[PDB]
Amino acid sequence: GVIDTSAVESAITDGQGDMKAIGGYIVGALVILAVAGLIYSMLRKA
Amino acid sequence: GVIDTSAVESAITDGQGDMKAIGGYIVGALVILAVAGLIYSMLRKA
Amino acid sequence: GVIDTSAVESAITDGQGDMKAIGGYIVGALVILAVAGLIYSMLRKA
Amino acid sequence: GVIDTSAVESAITDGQGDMKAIGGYIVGALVILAVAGLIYSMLRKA
Amino acid sequence: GVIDTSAVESAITDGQGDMKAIGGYIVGALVILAVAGLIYSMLRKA
Amino acid sequence: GVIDTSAVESAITDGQGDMKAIGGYIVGALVILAVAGLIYSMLRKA
Amino acid sequence: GVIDTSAVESAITDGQGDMKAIGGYIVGALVILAVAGLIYSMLRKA
Amino acid sequence: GVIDTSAVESAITDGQGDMKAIGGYIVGALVILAVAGLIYSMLRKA
Amino acid sequence: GVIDTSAVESAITDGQGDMKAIGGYIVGALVILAVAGLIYSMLRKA
Amino acid sequence: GVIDTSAVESAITDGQGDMKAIGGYIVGALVILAVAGLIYSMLRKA
Amino acid sequence: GVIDTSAVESAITDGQGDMKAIGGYIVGALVILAVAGLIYSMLRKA
Amino acid sequence: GVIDTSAVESAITDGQGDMKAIGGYIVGALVILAVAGLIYSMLRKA
DNA sequence: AAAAAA
């Protein structure tokens, strides 16, 4: 009496493979305010 | 004194084979609001 | 003893093809508050 | 005067064995926003 | 020994063609509280 | 065999024209806590 | 062979004219928790 | 064919007159954490 | 040809007088999580 | 025509007497991060 | 002309004695996310 | 007239024993940004 | 908001 849920794992494993894609696109934008955070500290201490 | 009910099981086993067909057509539409439910959460947390 | 449910899959596969259309129209509006979320952080840290 | 309900437990034990399958497919997608939640905190504190 | 049911399909195919008309008139009113739902979020985050 | 649904679109197009009216009355009250949010930041930084 | 249904429209047009009366009496009570919802937000942000 | 709904407006106008009473009892308790929020800032800056 | 419905209003006016009794017993339990909701906010801000 | 609701107030007055018990058990745990919040400030200023 | 309803109270007093059993099994699982909610706050404030 | 709820406590006591497992796996990752938070303060003060 | 910054 089953219902075919084969279209579930095919849909959301491709879903969770897309959460990883837009996680790496944020990490690449948070290191901008990490690098610029501490080369401001070099100019101030000088 | 029987009445031929051979046209019953031929009619509703093909009936319950059609309930399964339109059950799988709903599951394929509920995973749309499951995937889009949690890639909205990635954009908000970023 | 079947009932023609051929008008079902023709109606809701075109239905679930429309849920995808208005999912992509929301993702295009959530990245506005993702980009503007972290170019506010550049102005504050400066 | 019983009615054979042997097709019940054969149908829904296979049903509840499928709820477990799509529960583990969600847990694998909620840990994405748990890991990315706190490696954002490392970049901000730096 | 039939009864003419030709006035049935002429009456309810025009009936179900009217359910579609007042379905599209609701969708045009639910996007008002979808758009205004997330331009409130832009003003709050600012 | 139709039923006159001409009183539907006359009733809810005037309905959705009123959702827009009380959406603009909220936007005018959320910019108060947007402007006052960042002229507090000028006084604190001084 | 008709039956006089003139007492129908005289009874329920006055009925639907009363649903409008107690709809406007609820809207006047939901704006209390809309106004007080966002003057709490002014006190918290201060 | 009406039903006397005169006991409705007599019941909920006195209802919405009570929502205002317990709204003003919260505002009097949120200004405590507004005043104490910024006389802590005077002691810290000193 | 009436039927004595004098036992109706004697039964449900005493019924609706009891809905008011267990409404006031809930309001006395929802103010517990209103008071404790915002004296937690005083300890956190300190 | 009443129904005995004497088991209601006996059940939820003992219910709301238990919400007070686990409210005081949280307040005793939020003062830990209030005291330790500002004896960290003494060590830093030294 | 009664019908023996002695099997009613024997069936549902044992029923409501089982609602209490699975209420206490939830309370034991909600305190896990209460304790872990505020020992995360100690690590963040440090 | 009971229903065997013996499969409830066997299922969720093993459930709440798993919430504790993934609570301790987060605490081990929040002390990373507690230790690194204050050995950054040693390098800055030097 | 605190910690960065004075």
Domain ranges of chain H: 1-46
Q: What is the dihedral of CA L19, L25, L28, L29, to 10 degrees?
A: -110
Buried b (16+ CB within 10 A) or exposed e, D14-33: eeeebeeeeeebeeebeebb
Instruction: State which amino acid sits at residue F10.
Output: S
Displacement of CA L21 from its chain's centroid (Å)? 6
- Distance measured from the CA of protein residue L36 to the C1' of nucleotide M6, in angstroms: 25
Nucleotides on chain M that have an atom closer than 7 A to a protein CB are 1, 3-6
Q: Which chains touch D (3 or more CB pairs under 8 A)?
A: A, B, L
Q: How far is E42 from chain C (nearest CA, A)?
A: 7
DSSP character at residue C39: S
Amino acid occupying residue G4: D
K35 CA – M5 C1', rounded, Å: 35
Report the distance separating Cα L21 and Cα L17, nearest Å.
7
Whole-number Å distance between alpha carbons of E24 and H46: 64
Separation in Å: M3 C1' and J25 CA? 29
Pick from E18, I13, F6, I44: nearest CA to H36: I44
The 8-class DSSP code of residue D22 comes to H
Determine whether the interchain pair K43/L27 forms a contact, defined as Cβ–Cβ distance below 8 Å.
Answer: yes
Q: How many CB atoms lie within 10 A of CB A26?
A: 18
Closest CA–CA distance from residue K23 to any residue of chain L (Å): 11
Residue A37, nucleotide of least CA–C1' distance: M4
Q: In 3-state terms, chain I is what percent helix, strand and coil (to 5)?
A: 80, 0, 20
The dihedral sign for the CA sequence F35, F37, F41, F44: positive
Give the count of beta carbons closer than 10 Å to the beta carbon of residue B46: 22
Mention every residue, 6+ apart, whose C-beta is less than 8 A from residue A29. C38
Q: How many residues does chain K have?
A: 46
- The answer to whether the CB of E39 falls within 8 A of the CB of F27 is yes
Dihedral sign, CA of C28, C34, C36, C42? negative
Using alpha carbons, select from K10, K36, D9, G38 the residue that is nearest to residue F29: G38
> Is residue E27 within 8 Å of residue F14, measured between CB atoms?
no
Task: Report CA(D42)–C1'(M1) in Å, whole number.
Answer: 20
Could you tell me the two tokens for B2?
């029987």
Q: DSSP characters for K1-46?
A: -----HHHHHHHHHHHHHHTHHHHHHHHHHTHHHHHHHSHHHHHH-
Q: For chain F, how long is the longest CA-to-CA vector?
A: 75
Give every CB contact of residue D12 below 8 A, 6+ residues apart in sequence. A1
Q: State the burial class of residue A12 (Cβ atoms within 10 Å of its Cβ: 0-12, 13-18, 19+).
A: buried
Distance set, CA K6 to CA E43, G9, K2 (Å): 64, 52, 11
Rg (CA), chain H: 21
| Residues in contact with K42: Cβ distance below 8 Å, sequence separation at least 6, in sequence order | J32, J33, J36
Cβ of C20 less than 7 A from strand M:
no
Closest to K36 in 3D by CA, of L25, C32, C37, I39: L25
Name the residue among L26, B22, F26 with its Cα closest to residue K33.
L26
- State the Cα–Cα distance between residues A43 and B11, nearest whole angstrom: 84
Which of E44, I45, I43 is CA-nearest to residue H34?
I45
What is each CA distance from C7 to C2, C13, F6, in whole angstroms? 14, 10, 28
CA distance D35 to L25: 11
Interface test with E, best of F2, F3, F14 (most E CBs within 10 A): F2
SS3 category, J4: coil
What DSSP designation does G39 have?
S
Neighbours of A23 (CB within 10 A): 19
Rounded to 10°, the helix I6-19/I21-30 angle is: 10
Taking the C-alpha atoms of residue A24 and residue B46, their distance in angstroms, rounded to an integer, is: 11
Strand, coil or helix: what is H31?
coil
Best CA proximity match to K41, nearest among J36, I34, B41: J36
CA distance E19 to E16: 5
Cα J36 from Cα I46, distance rounded (Å): 11
Which of K12, K36, K44 faces L1 most closely, judged by CB atoms? K12
Give yes or no for a contact between K26 and L16, defined as CB atoms under 8 angstroms apart: no
Which residue from B43, L13, B16 is spatially nearest to A2, judged by alpha carbons? Answer: B16
Nearest to G42 by CA among F25, F36, I46: F36
Tell me the CA end-to-end span of chain A in Å, nearest whole number: 75
The span from the CA of C26 to the CA of C20, in Å, is 10
- Determine the 3-state secondary structure of B10 from DSSP: helix
Residue that the structure tokens 């960290």 belong to: J40
Helix axes B21-30, B6-19, angle to 10 degrees: 10
Question: Number of CB pairs < 8 Å for I and J?
Answer: 49
Give counts: helices (H), strands (E), chain D. Answer: 4, 0
Q: Is the CB of F45 under 7 A from strand M?
A: yes
Cβ-Cβ contacts under 8 Å for K33 (sequence gap 6 or more): L19
If interface means Cβ-Cβ distance under 8 Å, which residues of chain J face chain I?
1-3, 5, 8-9, 12-13, 15-16, 19-20, 23, 26-27, 30-31, 34, 37-38
Contact C34, B43 (CB under 8 A): yes
Q: Closest Cα to residue F32, out of H41, A24, I41, G38?
A: G38
Q: Decide: CB of L45 under 7 A of nucleic strand M.
A: no
Per the CB < 8 Å rule, is G43 touching H31?
yes
Please tell me whether any atom of strand M lies within 7 Å of the Cβ of J6.
Answer: no
Type of residue numbered E15: G
Could you tell me the end-to-end alpha-carbon distance of chain B, in angstroms, rounded to an integer? 75
CA atom of L38 to C1′ atom of M6, Å: 21
**Which amino acid, J33?**
L
Return d(Cα B25, Cα C7) in angstroms, integer.
12
Residue with tokens 């205004």: E36
Which are the contacts of E14, defined by CB distance < 8 A and separation ≥ 6?
Answer: F1, F2
Q: How many residues in total does chain H contain?
A: 46
Q: How close, in Å, is residue E36 to chain C by CA atoms?
A: 12
Through-space separation of residue G45 CA and nucleotide M1 C1' in angstroms: 9
Interatomic CA distance for residues I36 and J19, integer angstroms: 10
Per CB-CB distance under 8 Å, the chain G contacts of H28 are none
Cα–Cα distance, B12 to C2 (Å, whole number): 8
**Distance (Å, whole) CA J30 – CA K38:** 8
Spell out the residues 6+ positions from residue K39 whose beta carbon is closer than 8 angstroms to its own.
Answer: L27
Nearest-angstrom CA–CA distance, I31 and H17 = 18
G-side interface with F, Cβ within 8 Å?
38, 41-42, 45-46
The chains in contact with chain F, meaning 3 or more Cβ pairs closer than 8 Å, are E, G
Contacts of A2 (CB under 8 A, 6+ apart): D11, D14, D15, D18
Residue A2, sorted as left (phi over 0), alpha (psi -120 to 50) or beta, turns out to be beta
Q: Which residues of L touch K11 (CB under 8 A)?
A: 1-2
Q: What distance in Å separates the CA atoms of residue D12 and residue D16, rounded to the nearest whole number?
A: 6
Q: H-type helices in chain A, by residue range?
A: 6-19, 21-30, 32-38, 40-45
- Taking each helix axis as running N to C, give the angle between helix F6-19 and helix E21-30, from 0 to 180 degrees, rounded to the nearest 10: 10
H38 touches strand M (CB under 7 A): no
Residues F17, F18, F23, F29, CA torsion sign: positive
Between CA I4 and C1' M4 the distance (Å) reads: 82
Asked if strand M contacts A44 at the CB level, meaning under 7 A, the answer is yes
The residue lying closest to nucleotide M6, measuring its CA against C1', is F45
Give B31 to chain D, closest Cα distance, Å: 11
Residue J20's contacts (CB-CB under 8 Å, 6 or more residues apart) are I32
Q: How far apart are CA H34 and CA G43, in angstroms?
A: 6
- State yes or no: chains I and H have 3 or more CB pairs below 8 A: yes
- The label of the residue with tokens 């309810």 reads E12
Give the long-range contacts of residues G23-28, CB within 8 A, separation 24 or more. G25/H8, G25/H9, G25/H12, G25/H13, G26/H12, G28/H16
All residues of chain L having their beta carbon less than 8 Å from the beta carbon of residue D38 are 29-30, 33
User: Measured from the CB, is L44 under 7 Å from any atom of strand M?
Assistant: yes
Q: Are K43 and L30 in contact (CB under 8 A)?
A: yes
Contact B27/A8, CB-based, under 8 Å?
Answer: yes
Do F18 and E34 form a contact (C-beta atoms < 8 A)? Answer: no
First to last CA, chain F: 75
Query: And the tokens for H2?
Result: 């009406």
